[PDB]
Design a protein around this ligand. Structure first.
Ligand SMILES: [Zn+2]
Length: 268
């Protein structure tokens, strides 16, 4: 499917269109302000800021975990899923974890309902790991460059876990890419897979790219994506969940919220 094809859904959970970025930010601000989270602006893309939000007064006894969403503008259940999750959270959460968020990496694609940003770039690629260091290549987008410029901040934010919430518009079946320092998947991988399995049928088999999925899982597959790069940079575990964008939008929002919840429980 074309990376400029526009996808839009109605959510009765939020009573709005999935591309309603103005409403998205209004609720995001309210939830961030209620939680006491600190904004760290990384830069701008087409008039929108791309910001990292962080829980205040991080403690070294707690794990530092990063949840990111909205690298691809048509995968809007990720960002709205994050809003859902936050609406159900209290500042008490920050006693269990040092949470950092990238709630919407690709705002220009998100307001248009399409995968690429409005400049025809793919914000989720071009993160190469060379000479023991994260680096850009010719595919790194404006957003990726902003993320790479803050590589040290982001590695620190996700040393104990990186979850990125994606969606697959070509799929009716859920699946998850995971990274664990093991030849075989463990509870981390299997629990996320099962959480999605509670909302959707699972990608029992096939291949996404040259990558085989078995029982909803793609394990330790390294590419030039933000997640793989951060895991190579030192993120102890990583997961990129894929909810199926051919299913009901609010189910995806709830699935994305459940996965974030489970991710935090598994890593805390
Ligand atoms: Zn994606």
């Amino acid at each position: 499917r074309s990376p400029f094809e526009s996808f839009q859904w109605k959510s009765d959970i939020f009573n709005c269109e999935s591309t309603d970025i103005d409403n998205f930010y209004l609720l995001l601000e309210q939830e961030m302000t209620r939680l006491g989270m600190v904004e760290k602006n990384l830069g701008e893309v087409g008039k929108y800021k791309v910001s990292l939000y962080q829980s205040p007064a991080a403690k070294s006894g707690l794990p530092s975990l990063l949840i990111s969403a909205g690298f691809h503008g048509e995968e809007s259940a990720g960002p709205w899923g994050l809003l859902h999750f936050l609406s159900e959270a209290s500042a008490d959460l920050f006693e269990r974890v040092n949470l950092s968020l990238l709630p919407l990496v690709n705002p220009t694609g998100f307001s248009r309902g399409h995968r690429f940003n409005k400049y025809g770039e793919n914000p989720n690629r071009g993160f190469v790991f060379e000479n023991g260091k994260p680096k850009a290549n010719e595919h790194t987008s404006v957003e990726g460059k902003l993320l790479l410029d803050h590589a040290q901040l982001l590695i620190a934010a996700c040393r104990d876990g990186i979850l990125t919430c994606h969606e697959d518009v070509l799929s009716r079946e859920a699946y998850v890419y995971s990274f664990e320092p093991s030849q075989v998947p463990g509870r981390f991988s299997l629990d996320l897979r099962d959480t999605l399995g509670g909302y959707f049928p699972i990608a029992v088999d096939g291949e996404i790219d040259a990558c085989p999925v078995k029982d909803g899982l793609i394990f330790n597959h390294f590419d030039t994506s933000f997640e793989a790069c951060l895991v190579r940079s030192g993120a102890r575990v990583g997961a990129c969940t894929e909810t199926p964008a051919l299913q009901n939008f609010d189910q995806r929002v709830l699935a994305n919220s459940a996965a974030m919840t489970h991710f935090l429980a598994l890593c805390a």
